Write a protein that binds this ligand. Structure first.
Ligand SMILES: Nc1ncnc2c1ncn2[C@@H]1O[C@H](COP(=O)(O)OP(=O)(O)OP(=O)(O)O)[C@@H](O)[C@H]1O
Ligand SMILES: Nc1ccn([C@@H]2O[C@H](COP(=O)(O)O)[C@@H](O)[C@H]2O)c(=O)n1
Ligand SMILES: [Cl-]
Length: 304
């Protein structure tokens, strides 16, 4: 009820994600890695207000306010052009991004932004583009965009774009530790390739047991099953992340893991109150930039 919702605008919330499970396979023909991941959408979201305008524009507040490009480099720019081309219209809209999702943090914030734009423009124009086509467009924009449309909890395969919804039969309570800087996703995938050239480090087991924990609604069962094969790459590049993980664990978290390609650390807690406690101890531990509490699963990109 603090969202920017001027008359004639359409405002869409799209959530950040954490990978509860991320197995990384072979580098494909197309230059991407085959993935098996369980995506999970959390209450740390971006809020995107789109309006008809005389030209395409982007403005950003919140996370990355100084920082995030507002020209063609922005994934929301690309999304606006793509959606407009799909519907046979010029991308004549102003896009305002109120960001809580960290920049370059492994929570797919730009992908949330791009997904929101698709949904917002469809509604703003009453363009009638069905969910399956919005999904195809999202897939063109990037691997994490379709999940940002989809929300909830989901098994991503292929590059991450092919989604099968899974049951997460509870509210799960999270603490996120935002890092001092960011990591470039391509560098983290390159780094896992490099770590596998050097040795044969351990791979995750099948997702079966983790999926069963999720379907049971059981955070304590789930915690030790969480895992992310990019975590070794992210900690290779940012060694300090081990201190962050150790601190959140020692603060009371059931489990900590790097989210995605990092450097955000995610901490699964047993209750809301437990996360209150863990987040406080962690902010005073001197190990990360800033801390958040969040819950999941939440809905995918949705008109507010
Ligand atoms: N709307 C946006 N929000 C944040 N970063 C953006 C956006 N558009 C383009 N970027 C650029 O993309 C990179 C960061 O993207 P993002 O913040 O989505 O990383 P991420 O959240 O780690 O992505 P993923 O976890 O899906 O790989 C930076 O190079 C940044 O300049
Ligand atoms: N499945 C995936 C997803 C992303 N990536 C790496 O991350 C980069 C960004 O991918 P997206 O644009 O799909 O987010 C790719 O160019 C690639 O280097 C990958 O190598 N395998
Ligand atoms: Cl979908």
């Amino acid at each position: 009820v603090s969202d920017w919702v001027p008359t004639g605008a359409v405002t869409v919330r799209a959530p950040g994600k954490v990978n509860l499970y991320l197995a990384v396979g072979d580098l494909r023909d197309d230059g991407y890695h085959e993935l098996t991941t369980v995506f999970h959408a959390v209450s740390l979201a971006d809020d995107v207000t789109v309006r008809d305008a005389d030209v395409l524009s982007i403005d950003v507040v919140g996370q990355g306010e100084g920082t995030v490009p507002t020209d063609e480099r922005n994934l929301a720019w690309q999304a606006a052009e793509l959606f407009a081309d799909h519907v046979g219209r010029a991308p004549d809209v102003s896009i305002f991004i109120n960001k809580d999702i960290p920049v370059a943090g492994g929570m797919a914030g730009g992908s949330a932004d791009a997904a929101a734009v698709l949904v917002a423009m469809n509604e703003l124009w009453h363009a009638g583009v069905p969910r399956r086509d919005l999904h195809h467009l999202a897939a063109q924009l990037g691997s994490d965009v379709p999940f940002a449309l989809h929300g909830g909890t989901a098994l991503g395969t292929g590059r991450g774009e092919q989604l099968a919804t899974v049951l997460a039969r509870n509210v799960f309570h999270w603490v996120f530790a935002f890092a001092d800087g960011g990591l470039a996703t391509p560098q983290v995938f390159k780094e896992i390739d490099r770590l596998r050239e050097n040795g044969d480090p351990p791979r995750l087991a099948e997702a079966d047991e983790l999926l069963g924990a999720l379907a049971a609604g059981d955070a304590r069962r789930l915690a030790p099953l969480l895992g992310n094969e990019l975590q070794a790459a992210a900690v290779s590049l940012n060694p300090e992340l081990r201190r962050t993980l150790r601190a959140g664990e020692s603060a009371g978290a059931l489990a900590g893991i790097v989210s995605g390609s990092g450097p955000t650390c995610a901490f699964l807690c047993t209750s809301a109150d437990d996360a209150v406690q863990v987040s406080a101890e962690l902010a005073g531990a001197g190990v990360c930039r800033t801390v958040r509490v969040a819950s999941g699963p939440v809905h995918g990109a949705q008109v507010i």
